[PDB]
């Protein structure tokens, strides 16, 4: 049973600092959305440039769901983010999960670990 | 019901079809209100609203004409009757291109009551 | 003696006590209800109540209960008319042997009427010698309420009515001097809206031998009381649920079944003896027609 | 060969296939037989005994609906049965019933309980089609004189047997013999004696004990021919002229169009094979419609013929003067259901008995009021005709009111008789004339004298006023009794909605089907309960005590029916209209119940329906009709039923329905369905219409309904149309396939899923409503127009509202209507 957010064990909260190595260029959802500057301009939050959750947490779904692929493993799955008849766990009689849908959620789970801005 | 018949002028008047075009598209796109409506939000201000049309109509992105309607109703309006007022001209904008109405059809229909009897007939 | 109620509010009436429920019953306002808010009033301001007072039952603005030479020209509808001074031209014919059963002939043309004999009638308009009129019609709601020491435990449901202005004639006294506005009905303490009495003109009406318009439910006699003998009563029987004083112990709910208000009798003597106007009854009077309220 | 009715307001002629009848004929004369077998089982070799018993038998037939309730019950539950039972019984007794006493006759009548009542309904069915098909053939296969069935004709030629009757004749050999001389003409109009005469003798050699009697009948049928001089002839043949009162206008001979038959099929003289062969001559096209020219021309035609002697019969009209204050007397409905049964009771047959009794008792114990005098009697209203030799009408008038007065002087029950002159010797009056002279004679009501008394107000508390009797008499409960509802109580502990839940009804059919509700209802009670406390629950649908459930109620009306019978040409007209309408209003609800039953689900669900429907009516029939089916079921029914209003009684009906809680109070509940059934009318009147209301957590008043009509409802820009057409809800059933009553009791039965399912199907509307009652008219409109305008194809959004939007006239569109009639089955589970 990976249903388990009822009951909450632990908590653990990491605080750091993202650091670009690279040119780091914001996502821009704001395509073609000029605000006060030039052509088309980066996100920012009251004219601070911001790093958007979401797009972390894609790229670390991403990440996790080549990992769980990468394992070839029978226990563990990823489903098509697409289909709905996708579930997180099962536990048929030893069950197979899905680690994407266990650490940031899917449709019929929530996510476990939260991505701030 | 008058914010209603200034915003299905303002929709008659978007609704006009943008020449020279490969498809049969509107003057004025979905996104184009989409985005005065939320640049009103984001900035609370008539003046930069104002500026932001204007802004547009200069682009060739929104219809010269639709443009001068907008203008000289915002022209002196506060932000909680602009914000119901663009809300309406999304809604009668949005019900014109859902249903496939064409200029012809409305033309220069005033009243939005008139509107919705053509709808309703049609 | 006129006043004049400003309710423009909702309010209750007569209550038929269901369960626990509470359902209108008169479309009007009863005069033992009013009377009783009228001296509730004066106890709460002073204390000292007296008997002596009498007031008719308020009704709707420009409206009256109906009887029998006012019916509707639609068996279904609500479209009454009458003649003008019909009892002055009804009537009189009393003082001859005239046939009754000649002289209640309602087929004045074709599809003659059918009437309704106290019902709310509000007056339209002139049209010739036949008066134009329309039922009253009110407005109601439902109030239901719950019971609580946080959890529920009971229920409880009340009718209110709507009402515009009222009118009702009472006893010329400093009573409704020293009076301004009555909380009226089931719950006095409790559903209120806003209520006030209005002092106007003072009124002059006669009450003699002759055709009467009995507008509250008159009665002929009580505990062989003989008030007044009729020699023809047209109307409907009507049940009496009041209150009324006679000095020593006892003296609430007299349940006495009457007639109907807005019947029609023809007395030709009456008594002296203990009026029942304080008790709400007997407020007959002779008039023209339903314009007497002018 | 060639018959033809010609059908009314619609003005259509309908032909009648020659198989049929002649295929009924057999059943026919096997149910005479029956009837004359059970006659002298009943007699137990008596000759005149079962001749009174084989009239009363025959004049049933003609008269199945006033003596057989819409569904055969082996209970005595409806007032039919009870007038069956009296009709029949009061023969077999020597000593009269006494009519003082109401609690004293209806035990007596639930006495007189034998076999003979299943046996009649053994054969209801064939009596049923045969009296369908009396209702469906002219009398006169002449055109323009087609206007008038044969069950009508029929009716008023026993009636005119009854009053012309004078001297030594015998009567009931007369009786006997007029109506075997109608069904004679039904099934050959040219050799209707020849068929009689062959109808008597198969009868004879049917019926074993009535041998000499028939014989003498048949004998005395043939010997008295038509052309030979003889009383019991003339008196047929001036009856019959006196019941067609159409030969006596000049009108049909001075329209002379065709010129062709007019001078041979009409005239003095009749010849049936003259009429027949030119009905072939000019084909039945042209029959029906030079029959429609000569029947307007009549109805634009007046005559005015008064005949200077008496008037051989008087009609009497028996209705309650006033029955808001007795219904209102009783909150339960259990009580309310006896107290309605008891109104429709003593208005029709307590009334028929006394009158019956004063008869037999004025004449000498030597005749008796024939069966068929009953013209009405259900809901109230009564129509009963007398001889004009009990005296002065005045005099009649006076002493049933005596009698009345007497019998119900505690149960505050009066009524009110009007009597009219009905007929004269050789003319019969119009009904518009005979209801003018009724709406006269009613000043009468209005005279009243002063009493003194003392009547609890209600049924509440321990008054004071005149302390000489007793108080307020203590109950069970505690003390909520007053004497005239402890006495109603009384009467209803026995019989009444218990009876019914107690009862077993058979659907006779291809196959027989029962009912049995102490078998069929699912509601699991301790055998320390009481059903008919919990009688709104089981009727509402709780198959559980820990169950909520709203129940419906259902009251229809007919539309202009007043005018419309004003506008009558004769009495048989009158008469035949509401035949058609009474029965066709039977058969719709009869086949309602058959659609439900047939529903491809689980015999068990369809049982428990039927049962709770058929325990939840007051009274059907005419008019009036009051229904409380469960509120899952409740809307589909009504559309189910009244989708062919038209066609089977051909009058609109407008009716109101409501959804409130099973603690609702009932009489509050009835005025306030009443007010909407009256406020949902069709100005046009050429519709049915259909009014739902759901009262969701509000209780329900004729007030309320009034105020919120002028408050939301209005006639330029409203939601709530009220008056809705049958299509349109049809329609809307059809687009949420609710009308399926297969799916509506696959969600009933288990709202597990039937909740989540009508949640899903009622979610979008219920958000444009809410969204409605969010702003004002021109800003809804303008939002239903968006939600269009954003929907996919094939999406059920975009059907409902061009449903909602397209076809309306005004800027009036139904949508608190359609929201209701989605809630109330919604809430029904």
């Known amino acids: 049973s ?116 | 019901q008058d914010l209603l018949d200034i915003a299905t002028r303002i929709a008659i008047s978007a609704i006009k079809p943008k020449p020279k075009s490969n498809k049969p598209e509107p003057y004025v796109d979905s996104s184009t209100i989409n985005s005065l409506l939320s640049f009103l939000q984001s900035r609370r201000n008539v003046n930069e609203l104002l500026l932001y049309i204007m802004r547009q109509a200069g682009r060739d992105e929104i219809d010269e004409e639709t443009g001068k309607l907008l203008l000289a109703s915002l022209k002196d309006r506060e932000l909680k009757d602009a914000v119901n007022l663009l809300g309406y001209v999304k809604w009668v904008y949005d019900t014109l291109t859902g249903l496939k109405v064409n200029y012809n059809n409305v033309k220069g229909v005033k009243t939005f009551k008139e509107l919705v009897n053509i709808l309703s007939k049609v | 003696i006129l006043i004049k109620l400003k309710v423009k509010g909702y309010i209750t009436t007569q209550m038929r006590r269901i369960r626990n429920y509470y359902f209108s019953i008169t479309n009007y306002i009863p005069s033992t209800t009013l009377r009783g808010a009228i001296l509730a ?58 046939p009754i059963e000649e002289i209640m002939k309602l087929e004045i043309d074709g599809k003659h009427p059918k009437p309704k004999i106290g019902s709310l009638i509000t007056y339209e308009g002139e049209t010739d010698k036949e008066n134009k009129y329309r039922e009253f019609s009110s407005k109601s709601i439902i109030q239901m309420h719950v019971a609580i020491d946080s959890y529920k435990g009971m229920l409880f449901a009340y009718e209110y009515k709507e009402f515009d202005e009222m009118w009702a004639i009472a006893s010329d006294s400093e009573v409704i001097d020293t009076v301004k506005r009555i909380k009226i009905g089931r719950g006095k303490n409790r559903g209120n ?38 020699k023809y009563i047209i109307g409907d029987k009507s049940i009496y649920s009041g209150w009324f004083t006679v000095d020593s112990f006892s003296g609430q709910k007299p349940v006495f079944e009457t007639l109907r208000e807005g019947s029609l009798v023809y007395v030709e003597s009456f008594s002296n003896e203990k009026s029942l106007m304080p008790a709400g009854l007997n407020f007959m009077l002779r008039i023209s027609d339903l314009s007497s309220i002018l | 060969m060639i018959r033809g009715k010609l059908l009314l307001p619609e003005k259509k002629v309908v032909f009648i296939n020659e198989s049929e009848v002649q295929s009924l004929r057999k059943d026919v004369v096997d ?112 055109p323009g004189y087609n206007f008038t069935s044969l069950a009508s004709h029929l009716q008023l030629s026993s009636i005119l047997v009854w009053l012309l009757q004078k001297g030594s004749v015998d009567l009931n050999y007369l009786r006997i013999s007029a109506l075997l001389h109608d069904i004679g003409k039904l099934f050959n109009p040219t050799n209707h004696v020849s068929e009689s005469i062959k109808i008597l003798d198969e009868v004879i050699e049917g019926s074993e004990c009535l041998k000499t009697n028939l014989s003498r009948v048949k004998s005395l049928v043939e010997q008295h021919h038509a052309p030979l001089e003889t009383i019991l002839n003339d008196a047929d043949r001036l009856a019959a002229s006196t019941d067609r009162f159409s030969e006596i206008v000049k009108g049909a001979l001075n329209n002379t169009k065709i010129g062709e038959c007019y001078s041979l099929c009409y005239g003095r003289d009749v010849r049936t094979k003259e009429c027949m062969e030119c009905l072939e001559e000019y084909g039945e096209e042209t029959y ?106 005045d005099e009649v008038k006076a002493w049933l009111e005596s009698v009345s007065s007497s019998a119900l002087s505690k149960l505050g029950i009066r009524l009110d008789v009007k009597v009219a002159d009905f007929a004269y010797e050789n003319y019969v009056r119009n009904y518009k004339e005979v209801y003018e002279d009724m709406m006269s004679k009613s000043y009468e009501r209005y005279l009243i004298r002063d009493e003194g008394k003392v009547y609890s107000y209600g049924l509440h508390r321990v008054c004071d006023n005149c302390g000489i009797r007793p108080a307020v008499n203590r109950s069970d409960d505690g003390e909520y009794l007053c004497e005239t509802c402890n006495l109603v109580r009384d009467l209803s502990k026995n019989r009444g909605f ?115 429907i058929l325990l939840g009516v007051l009274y059907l029939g005419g008019d009036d009709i009051m229904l409380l089916s469960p509120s899952a079921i409740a809307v589909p029914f009504a559309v189910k039923m009244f989708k062919r209003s038209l066609e089977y009684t051909g009058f609109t009906f407008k009716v109101g329905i409501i959804s409130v809680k099973p603690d609702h109070p009932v009489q509050f509940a009835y005025g306030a369905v009443n007010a909407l059934m009256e406020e949902s009318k069709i100005h046009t009147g050429e519709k049915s219409s259909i009014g739902v209301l759901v009262f969701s957590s509000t209780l329900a008043s004729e007030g309320v309904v009034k105020s919120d009509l002028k408050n939301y409802r209005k006639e330029k820009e409203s939601f709530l149309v009220v008056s809705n057409d049958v299509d349109d809800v049809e329609r809307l059933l059809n687009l949420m396939e609710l009308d399926d009553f297969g799916k509506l009791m696959e969600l009933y039965w288990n709202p597990e899923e039937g909740r989540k399912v009508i949640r899903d199907k009622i979610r979008s509307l219920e958000r444009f409503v809410n969204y409605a009652d969010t702003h004002d008219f021109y800003n809804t409109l303008a939002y239903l127009i968006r939600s269009k305008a954003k929907s996919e194809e094939n999406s059920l959004i975009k059907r409902i509202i061009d449903l909602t939007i397209k076809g309306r006239d005004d800027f009036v569109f139904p949508l608190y209507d359609y929201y209701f009639i989605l809630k109330s089955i919604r809430v029904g589970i």
């Open chain 4, 288 to 393: 029906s419609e030079e029959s429609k020219r000569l029947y307007d021309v009549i109805s634009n035609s007046v005559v005015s013929q008064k005949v200077e002697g008496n008037a051989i019969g008087y009609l009497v009209y028996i209705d309650f003067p006033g029955i808001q204050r007795f219904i209102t007397s009783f909150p339960k409905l259990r009580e309310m259901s006896f107290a309605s049964f008891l109104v429709d009771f003593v208005t029709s047959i307590y009334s028929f008995i006394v009158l019956d009794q004063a008869y037999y008792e004025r004449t000498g114990k030597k005749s008796r009021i024939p069966a068929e005098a009953l013209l009405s009697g259900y809901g109230g209203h009564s129509y009963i005709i007398v001889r004009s030799d009990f005296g002065s009408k």
């Open chain 3, 41 to 98: 009033e004066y106890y709460n301001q002073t204390g000292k109540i007296d008997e002596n007072f009498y007031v008719s039952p308020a009704y709707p603005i420009k409206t009256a209960p109906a009887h029998y030479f006012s019916p509707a020209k639609e068996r279904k509808g609500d479209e009454f008319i009458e003649v003008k001074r019909i009892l002055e031209k009804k009537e009189k014919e009393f003082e001859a042997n005239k």
């Open chain 4, 31 to 142: 149910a005479l037989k029956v009837f004359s077998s059970l006659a002298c089982e009943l007699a137990d070799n008596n000759e005149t005994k079962a001749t009174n018993i084989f009239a009363d038998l025959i004049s049933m037939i003609y008269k199945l609906p006033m003596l057989i309730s819409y569904v055969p019950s082996d209970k005595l539950s409806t007032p039919h049965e009870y007038f069956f039972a009296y009709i029949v019984f009061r023969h077999l007794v020597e000593d009269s019933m006494p009519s003082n006493d109401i609690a004293k006759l209806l035990e007596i009548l639930e006495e007189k309980k034998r076999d003979e009542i299943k046996e009649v309904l053994d054969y209801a069915r064939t009596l049923r089609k045969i009296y369908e098909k009396l209702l469906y053939v002219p009398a006169d296969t002449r």
């Open chain 3, 193 to 230: 809206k806003v209520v006030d009495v209005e002092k106007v003109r003072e009124v002059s009406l006669d009450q003699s031998k002759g055709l009467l318009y009995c507008l509250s439910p008159c009665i002929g006699s009580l505990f062989g009381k003989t008030f007044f003998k009729a």
């Open chain 1, 2 to 117: 990976c249903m388990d957010l009822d009951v909450i064990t632990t908590v653990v909260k990491i605080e750091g600092k993202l650091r670009n190595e690279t040119l780091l260029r914001v996502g821009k959802g704001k395509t073609q959305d000029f605000a006060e500057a030039t052509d088309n301009p980066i996100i920012k939050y009251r004219d601070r440039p911001l790093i958007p959750g979401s797009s972390l947490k894609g790229a670390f779904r991403s990440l996790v769901e080549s990992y769980t692929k990468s394992l070839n493993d029978s226990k563990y799955y990823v489903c098509d983010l697409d289909d709905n008849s996708c579930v997180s766990c099962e536990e048929k009689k030893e069950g197979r999960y899905c680690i994407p849908c266990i650490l940031f959620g899917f449709k019929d789970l929530a996510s476990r670990v939260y991505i701030l801005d």
């Open chain 4, 498 to 612: 218990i009876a019914k839940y107690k009862s077993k009804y058979t659907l006779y059919e291809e196959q027989r089907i029962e009912i049995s509700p102490k078998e069929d209802i699912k509601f699991k009670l301790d055998k320390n309960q009481d059903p008919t406390s919990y009688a709104m629950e089981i009727i509402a649908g709780y198959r559980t005590t820990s169950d909520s459930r709203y129940i419906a109620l259902i009251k229809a009306d007919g539309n202009n029916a007043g005018k419309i019978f004003g506008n009558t040409v004769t009495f048989s007209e009158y008469v035949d209209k509401s035949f058609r309408l009474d029965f066709g209003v039977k058969k719709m609800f009869y086949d309602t119940l058959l659609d439900i039953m047939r529903a491809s689900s689980d015999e068990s669900i369809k049982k428990d329906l039927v049962s709770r």
